[PDB]
Symmetry: C6
Subunit: 213 residues, 6 copies
Amino acid sequence: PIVHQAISPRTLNAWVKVVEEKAFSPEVIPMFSALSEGATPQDLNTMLNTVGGHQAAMQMLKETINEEAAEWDRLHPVHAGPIAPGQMREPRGSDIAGTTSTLQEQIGWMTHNPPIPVGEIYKRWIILGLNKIVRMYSPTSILDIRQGPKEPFRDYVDRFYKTLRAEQASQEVKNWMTETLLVQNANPDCKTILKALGPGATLEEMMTACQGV
Amino acid sequence: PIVHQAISPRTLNAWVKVVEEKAFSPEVIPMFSALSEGATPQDLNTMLNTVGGHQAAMQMLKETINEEAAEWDRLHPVHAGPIAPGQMREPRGSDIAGTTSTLQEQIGWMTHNPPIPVGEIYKRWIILGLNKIVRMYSPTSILDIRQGPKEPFRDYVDRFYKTLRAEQASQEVKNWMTETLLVQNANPDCKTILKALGPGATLEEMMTACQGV
Amino acid sequence: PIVHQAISPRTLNAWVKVVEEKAFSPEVIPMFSALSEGATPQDLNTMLNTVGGHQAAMQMLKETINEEAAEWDRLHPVHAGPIAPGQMREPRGSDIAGTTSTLQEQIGWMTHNPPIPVGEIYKRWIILGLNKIVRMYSPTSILDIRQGPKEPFRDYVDRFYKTLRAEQASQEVKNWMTETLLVQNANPDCKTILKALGPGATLEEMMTACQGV
Amino acid sequence: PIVHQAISPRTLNAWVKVVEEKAFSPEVIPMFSALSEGATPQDLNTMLNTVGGHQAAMQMLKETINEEAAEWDRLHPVHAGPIAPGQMREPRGSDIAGTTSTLQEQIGWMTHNPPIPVGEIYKRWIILGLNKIVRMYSPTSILDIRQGPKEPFRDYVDRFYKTLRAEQASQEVKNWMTETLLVQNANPDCKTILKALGPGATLEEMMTACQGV
Amino acid sequence: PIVHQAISPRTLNAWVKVVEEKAFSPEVIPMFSALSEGATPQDLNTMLNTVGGHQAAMQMLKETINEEAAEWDRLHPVHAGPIAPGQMREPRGSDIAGTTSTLQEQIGWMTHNPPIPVGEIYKRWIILGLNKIVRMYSPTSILDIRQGPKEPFRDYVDRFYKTLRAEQASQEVKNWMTETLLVQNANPDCKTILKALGPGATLEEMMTACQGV
Amino acid sequence: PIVHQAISPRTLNAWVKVVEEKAFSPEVIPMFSALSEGATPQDLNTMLNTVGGHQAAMQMLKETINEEAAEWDRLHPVHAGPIAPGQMREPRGSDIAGTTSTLQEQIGWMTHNPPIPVGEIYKRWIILGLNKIVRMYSPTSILDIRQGPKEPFRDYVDRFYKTLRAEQASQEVKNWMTETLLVQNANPDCKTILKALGPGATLEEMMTACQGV
Ligand SMILES: Cc1[nH]c2ccccc2c1CC(=O)N[C@@H](Cc1ccccc1)C(=O)N(C)c1ccccc1
Ligand SMILES: Cc1[nH]c2ccccc2c1CC(=O)N[C@@H](Cc1ccccc1)C(=O)N(C)c1ccccc1
Ligand SMILES: Cc1[nH]c2ccccc2c1CC(=O)N[C@@H](Cc1ccccc1)C(=O)N(C)c1ccccc1
Ligand SMILES: Cc1[nH]c2ccccc2c1CC(=O)N[C@@H](Cc1ccccc1)C(=O)N(C)c1ccccc1
Ligand SMILES: Cc1[nH]c2ccccc2c1CC(=O)N[C@@H](Cc1ccccc1)C(=O)N(C)c1ccccc1
Ligand SMILES: Cc1[nH]c2ccccc2c1CC(=O)N[C@@H](Cc1ccccc1)C(=O)N(C)c1ccccc1
Ligand SMILES: [Cl-]
Ligand SMILES: [Cl-]
Ligand SMILES: [Cl-]
Ligand SMILES: [Cl-]
Ligand SMILES: [Cl-]
Ligand SMILES: [Cl-]
Ligand SMILES: [Cl-]
Ligand SMILES: [Cl-]
Ligand SMILES: [Cl-]
Ligand SMILES: [Cl-]
Ligand SMILES: [Cl-]
Ligand SMILES: [Cl-]
């Protein structure tokens, strides 16, 4: 990461083990982001290359990065000119993704006034592609989450918000799913109980209300 | 945490493993607090996102945070004005919870004269919500803790104060439960023995007194 | 601990694992003390809260701390007055135990000329309470330790000094137990052998003497 | 690595364990490169010597290094002359590979104005030889990767790009394999589906399209 | 250890695990010494207290320390006088063993011109007592080590020098045991072979000579 | 190692575990050398003492060191004279091996203008003795390595160069063994194939040539 310092063996080992155990579960992404705080594109690519298997996902992730790189290039067209002494060039999508830049060039951009934070830019595009993959490898839809007739409310809520966490939707949409589906898809016994509090009640209140039942 | 330094792989790994093994047992909270000393809201959210499962709890925790955020906003209304050079804006609940602020904005508030410690503020609200969840996921009530007819006193006391640690109550109330229930719910044999010391006796004295019996 | 630095994940993890494996065996206490070198009351309380189970002991430990706190208060009565700029208040038992002081207040006392070392003071009271608990949870008495008729001397000596380490007694008393009981409670065969050296002989000499027998 | 600092026990241990578990799988190479950031030729050779077994590969790796060393020597012929005070000699292939230079000589070249980065040069030649070995120890060819009649598309894509990652080919060639083979070798059912999007469709679109089938 | 720095959790954990696995095997002592480089008497005592079991040995170790303490006191008698400002007292055996001195007093002696290295002095006395215990808990004598009629020479030599390492003897004596016993106690077949080289032959030569046989 | 800094618990633990698992396999030596970068003779001896078992080897290693020490003494005879203030004595073989010098004396020699690097000198003599032992404990000879009639070429090459790595021979000799034996000892089927490339062919070419067969 940036200081340039080498990425620690236990950081790398942690990243590897995460993916083995959990595959593309939503929580892998914060872990990824945690493990890569202050990382350079080289460090980010290293991290992605140390994954074996899951190559279809890694390929999708590539394309997503290429798309983001091409978008960057459009907004930031590179001018012809000799980079003057005591000064650094403008980066291109490929430099951000680490394919056409060096470690020093990456070091150069990130430590400067102003900083051109290619680490945090590329990191944006990578997390972007990880969400698509999580979203894609999630098997079920939030509309299919229903409470079984004997299922403790708490377990339904765990399944509801787990499936929700992986959904393709903005916040306004997710608020709406919470507001509509949660109560809608409860089993009749508890569905009754909850309606009897109305739509101003907290999840604490709802969980404690259908607790016994 | 704050120095900004990345949160260590073993910190993160420790937090993950805690929750797998112990779920929402009261001792997870000091561990949480320990693992997050000097943490920024970004670091705190990272920690909370690396939990898979337990999403109903995480949702309740969200609401609790929103409530605390809205309370903060009431007491601290944000004024319109250009933030002047060499100066930093007033935070809003959403900035404290990390949703509408950057890492630098968080760094900005925490390192300053005076410090505006959004790390320790948000941490307050998170622990708050963890207590509610611990409290909620605790199965039994302190009123149900009774000594079995053959149960070594020491084992009853362990169950008493374990259930007590998870109770919804203030200190005055807990003193009262200790003072009333402990001796009240002992089995007849030992209940006799203890009454014969009176209400000035130490737990050491009480445990050593019903030791053989 | 003090530098304020956060307490390390492996310190915390070490403390947790100690108590799981060994419970309240005498050696847990040096470990505790080792793991808490330079710790603040907050750090000490953290460490104590990360223990689940064993709550009867933790309760006794509380009372012991309250007793020590009340004793401190007697010897150190707090005066009314405005704490003047460039100066720090006098601590009360509750501040030492971490319940009515902040991290900075604790930092304040410990780093100063002179230092008011609330870390090492509270640590005193905690170890105090741990000894009582070790002492209490020790099953046997040193008077009950006798050498079996076929028991290798070395194994008797291991049981003797293990039970001894956990006894409620001062040094003068322990010298006396060593001097009297060790030789007194040996089996007849070896009891003879040892008497034949007298009371000036080293444990090395005694162990090597009853070695074959 | 360079600061000279000793290479960490966990770095070394990590490198050893990598090769035991994964042999010469493509992902071992980024791991190698990660574990050796800032390494000297001595450190690089150490790392290679701590591998037991796999000696045929290590021998091929040697030859590759000798070839690269001899190529370096051709482009950089060494001049006769006394190395003047406050100055450092020109390196030869053998000095780069660590066989005819010292630690200080390596330290000398790497820290200087300009730097002569024998660490990153030799590292180039080593990774070069690792690719040949990965390439060689890869059992299958990309032309043999076909989708089974019941095989979920996602699993075919994983096998396609895994075999692809290990192929001997430049980027232009790999683009061509992706463009031609992937769709060509799909099973008839899904082959139809995909043709019906054409050759402008993303892997996301293709995977989600043959998802159900 | 000394800088005062707290002793690391993994140092402590390492020391504990050593004794569990290996008991009092000669190699535990270098490990002890390794783990305690730069340690204060407090740190040394901590290390010794974290051992459970083996208390007979710990008791012998105590006595040995008391003997060394009393010897120190004889050679270094303490003078009456007020320790003057900017100056430090003379230590007594009990101060060296950590029983009548503080951490600062220990810090005081060790960092000074001249240094009074109570860490390395007490460490001397501890290793002293560990040797006696190793020596004592070693079951066999070097005179009993004989080569079996089918026993590979190499295995006899391993048993010879293992038993030798644990013997009570000075270097002159050990040279003599090597010189006399090794060849003396070999089985007739190989005993012949070796005599036929004479007493100027290396262990390499001797091992390679009785290799096949 | 040198800064004097204590040798890390994980360094020591790593060294111990290496020898347990791998005994005296050639790769243990680079590991040894890696783990001991910048080590003092005291640190080197510590490392060697933490090995239990394998004492015949450790004894041979001693003799080898004594031989190297006596050779040093011959080339470097010690002069009589008072070591003058601001100056350090000339070392003797025994000082290099750590038996007649202190930690400071070792520190003294290694940090100086010029440096007298007793760490790297003694390390030379130790690795020297480790090679002899590896060489000796290697069971087979390179002349005995033949390809089985069904044995994949790659597996023969692994056995060839593994046995080769442990051989007593200089580089000129090893080049010759490679050049002569490898092709000579192949099975008839593949022996034919290879002869048909001649003696200018790379191991890559040879391995890929007998690949199918
Ligand atoms: C874990 C989770 N489940 C979801 C379901 C639907 C939509 C999103 C999610 C998330 C991610 C998720 O929302 N994580 C939270 C952090 C968090 C996690 C767990 C408890 C409390 C706070 C987050 O990243 N931020 C920025 C946040 C912070 C406070 C309030 C709201 C959001
Ligand atoms: C562990 C526990 N059990 C309880 C039951 C009822 C109410 C609270 C609890 C607690 C938490 C609990 O009280 N923890 C203690 C620390 C502690 C833990 C264990 C032993 C001694 C000190 C604490 O956080 N503080 C601030 C404290 C310190 C000294 C005295 C009183 C309180
Ligand atoms: C381990 C142990 N067993 C006992 C039995 C009765 C009374 C006390 C104990 C102890 C604790 C015990 O005495 N530990 C020793 C350290 C120690 C441990 C083991 C061997 C040598 C030195 C200690 O803390 N100190 C201050 C000490 C140091 C030197 C001499 C005497 C005491
Ligand atoms: C993992 C992999 N599979 C391949 C198949 C064919 C050819 C090459 C490969 C690779 C290595 C591979 O291409 N790794 C990527 C890093 C990477 C890995 C995984 C996902 C996203 C980015 C890489 O090293 N660089 C420089 C890169 C970065 C962005 C876009 C394109 C290339
Ligand atoms: C391991 C061992 N076995 C013995 C048998 C009899 C007497 C002593 C021992 C020892 C301890 C032993 O002698 N250890 C050696 C270190 C060592 C260990 C192993 C191989 C080479 C060097 C040691 O501490 N020193 C000071 C030493 C160094 C060089 C030559 C001679 C002695
Ligand atoms: C591993 C090994 N097998 C051998 C067989 C015969 C003779 C020696 C050996 C060795 C040790 C061996 O030669 N190790 C190599 C490092 C190395 C290891 C593995 C692959 C590439 C480079 C080494 O130490 N050096 C100095 C070296 C570096 C480049 C070229 C030639 C030698
Ligand atoms: Cl790669
Ligand atoms: Cl690409
Ligand atoms: Cl998230
Ligand atoms: Cl929300
Ligand atoms: Cl708590
Ligand atoms: Cl209380
Ligand atoms: Cl080697
Ligand atoms: Cl070579
Ligand atoms: Cl103790
Ligand atoms: Cl004593
Ligand atoms: Cl030793
Ligand atoms: Cl010797």
